[PDB]
């Protein structure tokens, strides 16, 4: 997270950390708990090649990485069939937990938007994670969960900015319709925030608008961050997750 504060100790009860085996269970990707047995995440964190589930764990909300861990095992990984790379689209995935989670005052599920929501500019949206704090700077050894409020852009205004300073012909669509744009040179997601939720407060309720997907570096001029647009994939999500 570039810019932004440390997160209060009760503000995003749905944030998930993904861990990979090694000398220690290292954090590498984010997610959100959307059902007591399902985690929503980015496809490029886990595919396109198949992974051994022995190497993966989920950790639920905690203020500081590693300090008090309770690693949950994963039963199944589901990646959208149309994913190969992030820039092409369908960067979305599901993890099914072995054991269901007790909903508690510390851990609660985020709500998915209705298919009609568009998230026009001016809405209040945040992104949260444990990723790098600047373009080459790791998060320091205490490892707090950070948060930042980002602006939203319309897709066509975002696509136009990506053509500035590029050889790409401006007939060639870069930002597809299953995507969403947010952030600016002072405020962005960064490496290791991938797969994390983007949430907006609509009519008093927090809805997950997007998933951190890709971008041309962190906080660079005319390069907003790209998010997978959750409303585009609701029918695919509800084929596995019990609504």
């Amino acid at each position: 997270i570039v810019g932004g504060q440390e997160a209060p100790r009760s503000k995003w009860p749905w944030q998930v950390s993904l861990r990979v085996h090694g000398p220690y269970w290292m954090h590498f990707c984010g997610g959100s708990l959307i059902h007591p047995q399902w985690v929503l995440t980015a496809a490029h964190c886990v595919g396109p090649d198949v992974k051994d589930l022995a190497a993966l764990r989920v950790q639920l909300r905690e203020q500081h990485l590693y300090y008090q861990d309770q690693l949950l095992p994963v039963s199944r990984i589901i990646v959208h069939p149309q994913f190969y790379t992030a820039q092409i689209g369908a960067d979305i995935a599901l993890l099914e937990l072995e054991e269901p989670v007790n909903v508690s005052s510390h851990v609660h599920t985020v709500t998915l938007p209705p298919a009609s929501e568009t998230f026009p500019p001016g809405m209040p949206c945040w992104v949260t994670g444990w990723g790098d704090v600047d373009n080459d700077e790791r998060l320091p050894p205490p490892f707090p969960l950070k948060q930042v409020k980002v602006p939203i852009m319309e897709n066509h205004i975002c696509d136009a900015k990506y053509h500035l300073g590029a050889y790409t012909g401006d007939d060639v669509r870069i930002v597809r319709d299953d995507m969403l744009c947010a952030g600016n040179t002072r405020r962005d997601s960064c490496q290791g925030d991938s797969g994390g939720p983007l949430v907006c407060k609509v009519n008093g309720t927090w809805l997950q608008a997007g998933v951190v997907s890709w971008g041309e570096g962190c906080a660079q001029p005319n390069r907003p961050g790209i998010y997978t647009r959750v409303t585009y994939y609701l029918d695919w999500i509800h084929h596995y997750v019990p609504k």
Epitope: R19, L53, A54, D69, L71, L72, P73, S75, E98, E99
Partner: antibody
Framework: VQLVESGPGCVKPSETLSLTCTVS????????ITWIRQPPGKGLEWIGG???????FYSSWAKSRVTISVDTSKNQFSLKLSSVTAADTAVYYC????????????????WGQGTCVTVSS | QMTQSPSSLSASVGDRVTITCQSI???????LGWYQQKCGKAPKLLIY???ILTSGVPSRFSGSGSGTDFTLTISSLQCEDFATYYC???????????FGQGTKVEIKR
């Protein structure tokens, strides 16, 4: 990188059997342990286990009498069986599931050398 | 609950053998494994998830199956293949999981 059981070897009836299993390097964080029993001449039967999430699972009969626990301060897993009887005479093993599942038997990759327990007067 | 067959078999060095395991229900999602136990030792995992060979196991062993019926097969008997063999599998999460009765393999020489 290996497990070791420990136990009394000989016990009388109506005591409680205690067993421990210790991991010799690397921590246990992230891993499940299951307890397997082998009566003389029989095959293998499953007692129970504990997941990486610290959830405990027990087979049908064990639920009445068994407790499984973990103590990170000692790098140990422990099995306790109440009210032992002669039919409990078996070799006991601890084994690891690398996925951290608390109740699965298809991928027990790492085993202790076993400990034999005799119930007799 | 499961059955494993045959309960014993006796074959020549060099030869091929097969072992079958069957169930009333179907394994949850490819959750079936094969173990080798030699006299006086703990079981060793050979095959997991129906068909993945464990590292360092010689490619003499192979396994396949279809949710309800599964087979373990050797390409060629060596002397140290003397052992008992067990299937194991799980039919849900958190519940019904069990071993098979085991099979005893004799070398003839």
């Amino acid at each position: 990188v290996q497990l070791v059981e420990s136990g009394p070897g000989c016990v009388k009836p109506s005591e409680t059997l205690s067993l421990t299993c210790t991991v010799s390097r690397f921590s246990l964080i992230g891993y499940a342990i299951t307890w397997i029993r082998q009566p003389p001449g029989k095959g293998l039967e499953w007692i129970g286990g504990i997941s990486s999430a610290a959830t405990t699972f027990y087979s049908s009969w064990a639920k009445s009498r068994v407790t499984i626990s973990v103590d990170t301060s000692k790098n140990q897993f422990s099995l306790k069986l109440s009210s032992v009887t002669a039919a409990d005479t078996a070799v006991y093993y601890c084994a690891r599931d690398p996925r951290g599942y608390g109740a699965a038997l298809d991928r027990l990759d790492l085993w202790g050398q076993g400990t034999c327990v005799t119930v007799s007067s | 609950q499961m059955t494993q067959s045959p309960s014993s078999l006796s074959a020549s060095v060099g030869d091929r053998v097969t072992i079958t395991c069957q169930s009333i229900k179907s394994v949850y999602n490819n959750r079936l494994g094969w173990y080798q136990q030699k006299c006086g030792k703990a079981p060793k995992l050979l095959i997991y998830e129906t068909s993945i060979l464990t590292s360092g196991v010689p490619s003499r062993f192979s396994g396949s199956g279809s949710g309800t019926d599964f087979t373990l097969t050797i390409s060629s008997l060596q002397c140290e293949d003397f052992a008992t063999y067990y299937c194991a599998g799980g039919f849900d999460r958190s519940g019904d999981t069990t071993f098979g009765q085991g099979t005893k393999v004799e070398i003839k020489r």
